[PDB]
Amino acid sequence: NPALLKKVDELELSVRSANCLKNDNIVYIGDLIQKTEAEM
C-alpha cells in the first residue's frame, strides 16, 4: 500500500502521541502498525 510512504507525524493525532513517536524514533507507519500491543 502507498500509505506506508507517509511519515508518522503526517496525521497529527495528539501531542502525547507525537511525543512518544518522536521518542521511539519512528519515521514510517509500518513499524507502528506491526507492533499491535507488545511494543505499545
Add this chain to the structure above:
DNA sequence: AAAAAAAGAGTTGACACCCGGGCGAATCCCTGCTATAATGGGAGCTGTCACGGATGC
C-alpha cells in the same frame, strides 16, 4: 485495588514598533505694478443630388 503531571488555560510583566499628530522649514500661488509713441482680422468652401420644406411680393 490507588494518585499526581506534560499540556491546556490564564495571565503578568517586558520590550519592538509603527503610523499619527505636532513643530518646524522650506517653499508654492496670487496679485499688482511696470510710464517715449504704439489705435478695425484670416481661413473656408466653390468637382453629389434630391427631397422636403421655410420665407418674400
